[PDB]
Design an enzyme around this catalytic site. Structure first.
Site, PDB file in Angstrom:
ATOM      1  N   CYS A 110       4.342  -2.815   2.236  1.00 56.06           N
ATOM      2  CA  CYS A 110       3.067  -3.188   1.637  1.00 56.06           C
ATOM      3  C   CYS A 110       2.846  -4.691   1.570  1.00 56.06           C
ATOM      4  O   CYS A 110       3.563  -5.395   0.862  1.00 56.06           O
ATOM      5  CB  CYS A 110       2.908  -2.586   0.236  1.00 56.06           C
ATOM      6  SG  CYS A 110       1.411  -3.186  -0.623  1.00 56.06           S
ATOM      7  N   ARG A 113       1.656  -6.857  -2.130  1.00 53.70           N
ATOM      8  CA  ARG A 113       2.500  -6.899  -3.340  1.00 53.70           C
ATOM      9  C   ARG A 113       2.418  -8.124  -4.253  1.00 53.70           C
ATOM     10  O   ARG A 113       3.071  -8.144  -5.300  1.00 53.70           O
ATOM     11  CB  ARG A 113       3.961  -6.641  -2.990  1.00 53.70           C
ATOM     12  CG  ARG A 113       4.245  -5.214  -2.591  1.00 53.70           C
ATOM     13  CD  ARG A 113       5.670  -5.073  -2.155  1.00 53.70           C
ATOM     14  NE  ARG A 113       5.881  -5.539  -0.783  1.00 53.70           N
ATOM     15  CZ  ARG A 113       7.080  -5.794  -0.280  1.00 53.70           C
ATOM     16  NH1 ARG A 113       8.146  -5.662  -1.057  1.00 53.70           N
ATOM     17  NH2 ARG A 113       7.214  -6.192   0.981  1.00 53.70           N
ATOM     18  N   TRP A 282      -7.072  -2.165  -2.879  1.00 57.95           N
ATOM     19  CA  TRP A 282      -8.239  -2.462  -2.055  1.00 57.95           C
ATOM     20  C   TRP A 282      -7.837  -2.732  -0.604  1.00 57.95           C
ATOM     21  O   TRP A 282      -6.671  -2.995  -0.294  1.00 57.95           O
ATOM     22  CB  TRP A 282      -9.033  -3.632  -2.620  1.00 57.95           C
ATOM     23  CG  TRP A 282      -8.253  -4.857  -2.818  1.00 57.95           C
ATOM     24  CD1 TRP A 282      -7.827  -5.719  -1.852  1.00 57.95           C
ATOM     25  CD2 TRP A 282      -7.798  -5.392  -4.062  1.00 57.95           C
ATOM     26  NE1 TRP A 282      -7.132  -6.759  -2.419  1.00 57.95           N
ATOM     27  CE2 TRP A 282      -7.104  -6.585  -3.776  1.00 57.95           C
ATOM     28  CE3 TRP A 282      -7.905  -4.980  -5.389  1.00 57.95           C
ATOM     29  CZ2 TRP A 282      -6.515  -7.365  -4.766  1.00 57.95           C
ATOM     30  CZ3 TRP A 282      -7.317  -5.768  -6.382  1.00 57.95           C
ATOM     31  CH2 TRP A 282      -6.638  -6.944  -6.063  1.00 57.95           C
ATOM     32  N   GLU A 287      -7.290  -2.388   8.412  1.00 61.37           N
ATOM     33  CA  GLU A 287      -7.009  -0.977   8.165  1.00 61.37           C
ATOM     34  C   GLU A 287      -8.178  -0.102   8.600  1.00 61.37           C
ATOM     35  O   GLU A 287      -7.989   0.959   9.197  1.00 61.37           O
ATOM     36  CB  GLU A 287      -6.717  -0.736   6.682  1.00 61.37           C
ATOM     37  CG  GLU A 287      -5.609  -1.596   6.107  1.00 61.37           C
ATOM     38  CD  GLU A 287      -5.280  -1.219   4.660  1.00 61.37           C
ATOM     39  OE1 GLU A 287      -4.722  -0.122   4.457  1.00 61.37           O
ATOM     40  OE2 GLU A 287      -5.576  -2.012   3.732  1.00 61.37           O
TER      41      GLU A 287
HETATM   42  C1  HEM Z   1      -4.297  -4.397  -3.983  1.00 63.15           C
HETATM   43  C2  HEM Z   1      -4.534  -4.366  -2.665  1.00 63.15           C
HETATM   44  C3  HEM Z   1      -3.551  -3.734  -1.662  1.00 63.15           C
HETATM   45  C4  HEM Z   1      -3.538  -4.068  -0.370  1.00 63.15           C
HETATM   46  C5  HEM Z   1      -4.442  -5.127   0.318  1.00 63.15           C
HETATM   47  C6  HEM Z   1      -2.505  -3.298   0.292  1.00 63.15           C
HETATM   48  C7  HEM Z   1      -2.196  -3.390   1.635  1.00 63.15           C
HETATM   49  C8  HEM Z   1      -1.456  -2.476   2.349  1.00 63.15           C
HETATM   50  C9  HEM Z   1      -1.462  -2.256   3.780  1.00 63.15           C
HETATM   51  C10 HEM Z   1      -2.309  -2.994   4.852  1.00 63.15           C
HETATM   52  C11 HEM Z   1      -0.589  -1.285   4.045  1.00 63.15           C
HETATM   53  C12 HEM Z   1      -0.306  -0.734   5.454  1.00 63.15           C
HETATM   54  C13 HEM Z   1      -1.076   0.577   5.613  1.00 63.15           C
HETATM   55  C14 HEM Z   1      -1.284   0.946   7.065  1.00 63.15           C
HETATM   56  O1  HEM Z   1      -1.350   0.028   7.925  1.00 63.15           O
HETATM   57  O2  HEM Z   1      -1.389   2.169   7.359  1.00 63.15           O
HETATM   58  C15 HEM Z   1       0.009  -0.841   2.808  1.00 63.15           C
HETATM   59  C16 HEM Z   1       0.977   0.135   2.648  1.00 63.15           C
HETATM   60  C17 HEM Z   1       1.524   0.572   1.450  1.00 63.15           C
HETATM   61  N1  HEM Z   1       1.152   0.143   0.184  1.00 63.15           N
HETATM   62 FE1  HEM Z   1      -0.118  -1.449  -0.308  1.00 63.15          FE
HETATM   63  N2  HEM Z   1      -1.908  -2.480  -0.662  1.00 63.15           N
HETATM   64  C18 HEM Z   1      -2.533  -2.704  -1.885  1.00 63.15           C
HETATM   65  C19 HEM Z   1      -2.211  -2.042  -3.077  1.00 63.15           C
HETATM   66  C20 HEM Z   1      -1.167  -1.153  -3.260  1.00 63.15           C
HETATM   67  C21 HEM Z   1      -0.805  -0.422  -4.477  1.00 63.15           C
HETATM   68  C22 HEM Z   1      -1.596  -0.478  -5.811  1.00 63.15           C
HETATM   69  C23 HEM Z   1       0.285   0.325  -4.196  1.00 63.15           C
HETATM   70  C24 HEM Z   1       1.120   1.257  -5.100  1.00 63.15           C
HETATM   71  C25 HEM Z   1       1.306   0.952  -6.385  1.00 63.15           C
HETATM   72  C26 HEM Z   1       0.669   0.071  -2.823  1.00 63.15           C
HETATM   73  C27 HEM Z   1       1.753   0.631  -2.180  1.00 63.15           C
HETATM   74  C28 HEM Z   1       1.886   0.797  -0.813  1.00 63.15           C
HETATM   75  C29 HEM Z   1       2.818   1.696  -0.188  1.00 63.15           C
HETATM   76  C30 HEM Z   1       3.848   2.622  -0.879  1.00 63.15           C
HETATM   77  C31 HEM Z   1       2.582   1.546   1.312  1.00 63.15           C
HETATM   78  C32 HEM Z   1       3.337   2.288   2.428  1.00 63.15           C
HETATM   79  C33 HEM Z   1       2.448   3.409   2.936  1.00 63.15           C
HETATM   80  C34 HEM Z   1       3.277   4.266   3.841  1.00 63.15           C
HETATM   81  O3  HEM Z   1       4.497   3.984   3.957  1.00 63.15           O
HETATM   82  O4  HEM Z   1       2.723   5.219   4.443  1.00 63.15           O
HETATM   83  N3  HEM Z   1      -0.242  -0.815  -2.293  1.00 63.15           N
HETATM   84  N4  HEM Z   1      -0.544  -1.596   1.795  1.00 63.15           N
HETATM   85  C1  D8H Z   2       1.746   9.045   9.445  1.00 61.41           C
HETATM   86  O1  D8H Z   2       2.792   9.010   8.471  1.00 61.41           O
HETATM   87  C2  D8H Z   2       2.688   7.914   7.551  1.00 61.41           C
HETATM   88  C3  D8H Z   2       1.287   7.782   6.953  1.00 61.41           C
HETATM   89  C4  D8H Z   2       0.853   6.319   6.979  1.00 61.41           C
HETATM   90  N1  D8H Z   2       0.423   5.774   5.701  1.00 61.41           N
HETATM   91  C5  D8H Z   2      -0.877   5.436   5.534  1.00 61.41           C
HETATM   92  C6  D8H Z   2      -1.805   5.847   6.487  1.00 61.41           C
HETATM   93  N2  D8H Z   2      -3.102   5.544   6.383  1.00 61.41           N
HETATM   94  C7  D8H Z   2      -3.543   4.838   5.332  1.00 61.41           C
HETATM   95  C8  D8H Z   2      -2.668   4.406   4.336  1.00 61.41           C
HETATM   96  C9  D8H Z   2      -3.221   3.606   3.178  1.00 61.41           C
HETATM   97  C10 D8H Z   2      -2.212   2.559   2.739  1.00 61.41           C
HETATM   98  C11 D8H Z   2      -2.844   1.740   1.644  1.00 61.41           C
HETATM   99  C12 D8H Z   2      -2.630   2.116   0.330  1.00 61.41           C
HETATM  100  C13 D8H Z   2      -3.208   1.390  -0.701  1.00 61.41           C
HETATM  101  C14 D8H Z   2      -2.965   1.794  -2.138  1.00 61.41           C
HETATM  102  C15 D8H Z   2      -3.988   0.286  -0.387  1.00 61.41           C
HETATM  103  C16 D8H Z   2      -4.189  -0.064   0.958  1.00 61.41           C
HETATM  104  N3  D8H Z   2      -4.966  -1.138   1.275  1.00 61.41           N
HETATM  105  N4  D8H Z   2      -3.621   0.673   1.937  1.00 61.41           N
HETATM  106  C17 D8H Z   2      -1.308   4.703   4.430  1.00 61.41           C
END
Ligand code: HEM
Ligand code: D8H
Ligand code: H4B
Ligand code: ZN
Length: 411
Positions: A110, A113, A282, A287
């Protein structure tokens, strides 16, 4: 490095020293002879539970500088006895918030963070029904959305017990668009969600059969049969995508939802498993603009767009895809901003992440980061994280992947 681990930024020559990895419990998939860094995805007895519980409590009490105290020690006996009697134990409210904020903090994939300590924890551990789940989730959505000024939040449903009574939100995200397969061959809407759309329909969802149809929530409480719910449309904030210069962009009829809210993951705290813990922040513009819109398996709009730019699609060497991708992403950022809906660009986000990363090394002795996920899917080397070496490892509490509910629950 010399005796303990160093990471380097090759653009700025800043070096950081990592000590935090020595606390790492879990295993990466990598061995000394193979690197699995680019691999997507590499109950519990009474006896397994107390070590994990104590490990968490030691960390929690060490976080408030009261490590080894009476409060610390009684809490340990308190939990140990809870596990004998009840095969489980219950987290204090304070611990639940610590755990949740730290699961975010340890999320190596993420980029956002820097925001980790600014998270709203809604304790929904008293919920017993799909209907209660619907109510908690609606409240989460409305709170988080905040009329466009997005706020980070997580809602934690009752923890797993005997694997036969767990809460699952069957949706991968709270808000996603439906996907409609056709023996025509083609696909309308989001193809990532075709099967899920099928389940909803095979559970009676009246699909408008449109392109950007917000899916119903499909909610499992206490291991029971999952039940359909329509999120109130007034709660689902959306942005029509238009371009700051190309007025023809509107004509593509693109729209996305503003609230990214992951709902298929498992939160682990002190050995306890919270299988239903939807969380939201957000969007980073890429994305939507790159992955959601341009991935071949998703909406796949590159052809349609570049066509309408009088572009040279004859050979790939004109970089027509690259051009269209940049415009699409400009339009996404512009739109969200014209609507005063929170969004961040990949330049700003990665930049803040470097700051955060350096913050974490300063005060925590490290920050686990997964370079493969941290680097944005476009313009990688002109953002700061491309040039930043990153150490990945697994700290706990954490968010984990878990099986899809439809490949388990049945009756
Ligand atoms: C506040 C703005 C936030 C932004 C800009 C952000 C940004 C991102 C981005 C770009 C990804 C990659 C997703 C992808 O490319 O598919 C990601 C993944 C992730 N985020 Fe953040 N995030 C935010 C908030 C949060 C919050 C509130 C949480 C949890 C408390 C969180 C936990 C995670 C986790 C666990 C992943 C891994 C998803 C996966 O492994 O499938 N994020 N985030
Ligand atoms: C395909 O297996 C893994 C799935 C990938 N994880 C995944 C896929 N599409 C969208 C997301 C959203 C991740 C995310 C979460 C949050 C809380 C914020 C953000 N900007 N982006 C996560
Ligand atoms: C094979 C590879 O691990 C996979 O395509 C990853 C690469 N990096 C990613 N990075 C982000 N942010 N999101 C993703 O889904 C992926 N996919
Ligand atoms: Zn490796």
């Amino acid at each position: 490095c010399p005796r303990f681990l160093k990471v380097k930024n090759w653009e700025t020559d800043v070096v950081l020293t990592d000590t935090l990895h020595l606390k790492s419990t879990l295993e990466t998939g990598c061995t000394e002879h193979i690197c699995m860094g680019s691999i997507m995805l590499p109950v519990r007895t009474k006896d397994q539970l107390f070590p994990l519980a104590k490990e968490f409590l030691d960390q929690y009490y060490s976080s408030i500088k009261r490590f080894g105290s009476k409060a610390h020690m009684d809490r340990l006996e308190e939990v140990n006895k809870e596990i004998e009697s009840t095969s489980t134990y219950q987290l204090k409210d304070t611990e639940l918030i610590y755990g949740a904020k730290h699961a975010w903090r340890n999320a190596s994939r993420c980029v956002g963070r820097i925001q980790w300590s600014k998270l709203q924890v809604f304790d929904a551990r008293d919920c017993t029904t799909a209907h209660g789940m619907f109510n908690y989730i609606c409240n989460h959505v409305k709170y988080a959305t905040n009329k466009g000024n997005l706020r980070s939040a997580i809602t934690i449903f009752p923890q797993r017990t005997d694997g036969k009574h767990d809460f699952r939100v069957w949706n991968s995200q709270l808000i996603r668009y439906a996907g409609y397969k056709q023996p025509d061959g083609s696909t309308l809407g989001d193809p990532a969600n075709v099967q899920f759309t099928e389940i909803c329909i095979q559970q009676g969802w009246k699909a408008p059969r449109g392109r950007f149809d917000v899916l119903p929530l499909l909610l499992q409480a206490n291991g029971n049969d999952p039940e359909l719910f329509q999120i109130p449309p007034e709660l689902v904030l959306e942005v029509p995508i238009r371009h700051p210069k190309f007025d023809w962009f509107k004509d593509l009829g693109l729209k996305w939802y503003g609230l990214p809210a992951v709902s298929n993951m498992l939160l682990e705290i002190g050995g306890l498993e919270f299988s239903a813990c939807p969380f939201s922040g957000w969007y980073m513009g890429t994305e939507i603009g790159v992955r959601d819109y341009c991935d071949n398996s998703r909406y796949n709009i590159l052809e349609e767009v570049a066509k309408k730019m009088d572009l040279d699609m004859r050979k790939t060497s004109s970089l027509w895809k690259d051009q269209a991708l940049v415009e699409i992403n400009i339009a996404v950022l512009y739109s969200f901003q014209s609507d005063k809906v929170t969004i961040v660009d990949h330049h700003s986000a990665t930049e803040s992440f470097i700051k955060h990363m350096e913050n974490e090394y300063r005060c925590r002795g490290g920050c686990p980061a997964d370079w493969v996920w941290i680097v944005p899917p476009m313009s990688g080397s002109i953002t700061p994280v491309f040039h930043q070496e990153m150490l990945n490892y697994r700290l706990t509490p954490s968010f984990e992947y878990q099986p899809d509910p439809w490949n388990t629950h049945v009756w």
